[PDB]
Design a binder for this molecule. Structure first.
Ligand SMILES: [Zn+2]
Lengths: 124, 125, 242, 107, 95
RNA sequence: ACCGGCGGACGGCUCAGUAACACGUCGGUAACCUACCCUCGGGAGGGGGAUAACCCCGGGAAACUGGGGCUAAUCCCCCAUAGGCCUGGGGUACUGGAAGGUCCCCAGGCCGAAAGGGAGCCGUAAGGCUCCGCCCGAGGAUGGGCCGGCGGCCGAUUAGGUAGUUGGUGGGGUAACGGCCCACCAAGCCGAAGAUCGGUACGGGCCGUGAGAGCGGGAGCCCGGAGAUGGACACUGAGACACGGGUCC
């Protein structure tokens, strides 16, 4: 389970990539979108990564991600399962028409070993 | 959906075969069972041609008039009788023909809650 | 297979009131909704191109119309699909020309030259009369136009009466009543394009229309519908109708 | 009162909302004369009208029947065999689209 | 080759003059557009750079060929009104 | 290039299905809806919020698609007044052949608008002129929905068919009236003048033939109806349950 986690700084609009192979992936696994995790708990030296003087209380907010198959994660579907849902808007669908609905494949909010990329927002 | 097109039996007792698919303009909506509650609940429905309807699902107040045009807003307590259905009286469902009793006595409904979203009634002498 | 409104009109299916070649091409302009009916109307494109021959192509006709060179009822009309109906005044100030649209003896629409002084008058038959919010009376004319008056003047107007309106100012000039001896002009039917004086009016039960008998100049008596009888005078026509 | 027909109204009064004489029902369209053949259904009568149809090829006529179901207002209590007048109205039921307006003659 | 002006009309909404003419000629080739325009301009005193020959049409077994032309008041108006193809055919634009 | 508006429901193709108010004709809707367009009478007041594009970082073999920041509108939301609907009591002002219609006065309630936005020419500014615009009300106009009378094949080696079936009362739903649906009350309704069932078929204007009566066909053009591999469903829109849109077998 090699994650390609993305860290985005809301105060600068800049994002960086960090690839994590094991050990630290277990703590991330099982979490749900909307949960905060201290940066130190992931052995991330984001201060030197971003060349900043980030405080010591920085916390990692997970907002979503994707899979090996490229199907995104809907923060609304419960459980670490892949489902087909008829979507009109929101994550996983781009309407392109006034009111159309198309069926797409998505995954639940909970993180699973199948996840390959996890997006994270820095919370000071 | 709730089709409201032609019947499939002739008046002579014969059988009719559909010559076309169901059309959108011929479709109805689910019945609105206005129930007495502690707070009014209404919804907006977009109808044919872009027009609009106000559907009342829960009714709390009623506008009661007594022989002189003097209207009062009085809370609904219970439904006494409803000739429309034999079970509506027991299920406490308001209907255009229902008879209710409010703080100022018995009244008979004269409006259609499912079509205009208002409960109007006349006091019974 | 039909799901909504039509946008096209085949030439063979065009109204019989148009002086159009029904076999030269396939399509014809579909009139936009407007003042008069489909049968008593013709798109301004045909007036500009065929009737008058001021343009040889629809592109030229559209350019001239957009240049605001044509006035109908005293107002400049730019769209080439505008309906033009009976008792309408078409004005070309640049050439100083003025025409009145009238039915023919065979039901086709024609342009009758008129005088400049007369070009400012439009007759309008009161198709209906009702009351609107407030205490005002609304009059609906044969071309779909509307006018508003006060409750005091309610008795000054009635159905089938004629009103002479000054265009484009939209001002009342005179009211011609519908009564015995009133000069009338037939707008449609078998007796279209005939004129005379009212002689008798007959009513019938249910929704059957009224029937009116008209005496022509030569003395012949004919019949038509009251709605088809258009009042255009009292003793002698106030509008040239030959 | 008159409802567009040159016929005398019924003598007595009724409270049927679907009575053109004493109700909100409006009559418009065709008017027919017929003979009542059935009156069993409640407030309904079947009116039969006979007419001749011309067969071109044989240059001969043939009798034909026209059965119509019409609403029977309480004031106009039509029976079997009566000659009645009916007028077209809005759809009142699956088959009833006419209303009896008067009884031309009673059997 | 003799040109007879059957009709001349003044269009004022479109600032032009419409000329209908007939070219009578005994057995000879159908007259060319350049020759027709030159003769018409010389005869009717028109502006050479503002006349466009709509057509010169010959008929079956006839010595009279009909012709329709237009003479504008303004070069800009001519360019704005006339389609490109007719002007190219008459050789008013180099293409 | 993107947001945003309109259109994409017309046109084009086929005759499968359908013996039916599908089609032809005459009438009705006083029982109903309609963007575009026309006329008249009115209005445009105060606030608020996202996000596309773009930038950083991607994921996915593709098809597609995630996270973070920064923005505008004729984008979206809220408040205010006009306006819309229901009901009760009074006067009769209007059209109609006839008012459950329209108008006026009180009463109880629900719902509830806009874009003074854009362009040009002047004007020191202010302000002005013009062009295309936005919202509400009453009418039209355009395209339809629904209903009625009459008319147009063969089989009796098919004689009985019908049970929401026929009608009623009270309601629901619809844009609209209606057993269209629902709850109860009755036994009604169709039929040898051929019901029911079965065979065949898109209907008409028309065409082929004959001296005519008549017989036969009704693909090409026009009008109307259905279908988009066979079925069944819904979203957006004035209009579709939609040939080059959507969901399931
Ligand atoms: Zn009665």
């Amino acid at each position: 389970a090699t994650f390609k986690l993305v860290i985005s700084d809301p105060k600068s609009g800049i994002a960086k990539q960090v690839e994590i192979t094991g050990a630290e992936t277990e703590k991330l696994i099982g979490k749900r979108i909307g949960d905060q995790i201290p940066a130190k708990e992931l052995n991330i030296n984001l201060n030197e990564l971003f060349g900043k003087e980030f405080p010591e209380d920085v916390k990692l907010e997970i907002r979503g991600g994707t899979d090996k198959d490229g199907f995104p994660m809907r923060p609304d579907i419960h459980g670490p399962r892949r489902v087909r849902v008829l979507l009109s808007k929101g994550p996983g669908f781009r309407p392109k028409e006034k009111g159309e609905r198309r069926k797409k494949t998505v995954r639940g909010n909970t993180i699973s070993p199948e996840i390959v990329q996890v997006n994270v927002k820095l919370v000071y | 959906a709730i089709w409201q097109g032609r019947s499939l039996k002739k008046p002579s007792g014969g059988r009719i075969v559909l010559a076309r698919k169901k059309r959108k303009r011929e479709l109805g909506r689910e019945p609105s069972n206005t129930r007495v509650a502690e707070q009014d609940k209404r919804k907006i429905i977009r109808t044919y041609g872009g027009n609009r309807k106000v559907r009342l699902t829960a009714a709390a107040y009623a506008n009661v008039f007594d022989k002189s045009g003097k209207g009062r807003k009085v809370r609904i307590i219970r439904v006494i009788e409803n000739p429309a259905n034999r079970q509506f009286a027991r299920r406490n469902i308001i209907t255009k023909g229902a008879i209710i009793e409010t703080e100022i006595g018995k009244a008979k409904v004269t409006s259609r809650p499912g079509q205009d979203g208002v409960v109007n009634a006349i006091l019974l002498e | 297979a039909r799901k909504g409104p039509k946008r096209h009109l085949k030439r063979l299916a065009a109204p019989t009131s148009w002086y159009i070649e029904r076999k030269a091409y396939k399509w014809a302009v579909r009139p936009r909704p407007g003042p008069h009916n489909m049968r008593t109307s013709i798109p301004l494109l045909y007036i500009v191109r065929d009737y008058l021959g001021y343009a040889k192509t629809a592109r030229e006709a559209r350019k001239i119309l957009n240049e605001g060179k044509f006035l109908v009822d005293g107002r400049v009309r730019k769209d080439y699909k505008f309906p033009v109906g009976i008792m309408d005044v078409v004005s070309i100030p640049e050439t100083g020309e003025h025409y009145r649209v009238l039915p023919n003896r065979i039901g086709k629409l024609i342009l009758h030259p008129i005088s400049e002084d007369e070009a400012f008058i439009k007759p309008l038959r009161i198709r209906n009369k009702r009351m609107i919010k407030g205490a005002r009376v609304q009059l609906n004319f044969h071309d779909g136009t509307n006018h508003i008056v006060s409750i005091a003047e309610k008795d000054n107007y009635f159905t089938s009466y004629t009103v002479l309106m000054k265009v484009p100012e939209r001002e009342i000039l005179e009211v011609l009543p519908f009564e015995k001896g009133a000069y009338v002009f037939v707008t449609q039917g078998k007796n279209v394009a005939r004129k005379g004086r009212i002689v008798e009016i007959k009513r019938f039960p249910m929704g059957w229309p009224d029937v009116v008998t008209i005496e022509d100049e030569e003395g012949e008596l004919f019949d038509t519908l009251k709605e088809y009888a258009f009042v255009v005078g009292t003793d002698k026509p106030k509008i040239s109708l030959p | 009162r008159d409802i567009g027909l040159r016929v005398q109204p019924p003598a007595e009064k009724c409270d049927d909302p679907k009575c053109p004489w004493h109700g909100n029902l409006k009559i418009h369209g065709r008017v027919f004369e017929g003979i009542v053949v059935s009156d069993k259904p409640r407030k309904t009568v079947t009116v039969e009208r006979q007419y001749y149809f011309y067969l071109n090829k044989y240059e001969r006529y043939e009798l034909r029947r026209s059965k119509i179901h019409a609403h029977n207002p309480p004031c106009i209590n039509a029976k079997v065999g009566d000659k009645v007048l009916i007028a077209e109205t809005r759809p009142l039921s699956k088959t009833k689209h006419f209303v009896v307006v008067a009884v031309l003659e009673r059997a | 080759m003799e040109i007879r002006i059957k009709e001349i009309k003044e269009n004022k909404l479109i600032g032009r003059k419409e000329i209908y003419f007939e070219i009578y000629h005994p057995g000879e080739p159908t007259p060319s557009r350049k020759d027709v325009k030159g003769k018409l301009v010389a005869m009717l005193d028109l502006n050479p750079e503002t006349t466009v020959i709509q057509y010169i049409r010959s008929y079956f077994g006839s010595y009279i060929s009909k012709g329709y032309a237009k003479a504008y008041d303004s070069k800009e108006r001519m360019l704005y009104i006339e389609p490109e193809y007719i002007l190219i055919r008459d050789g008013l634009i180099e293409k």
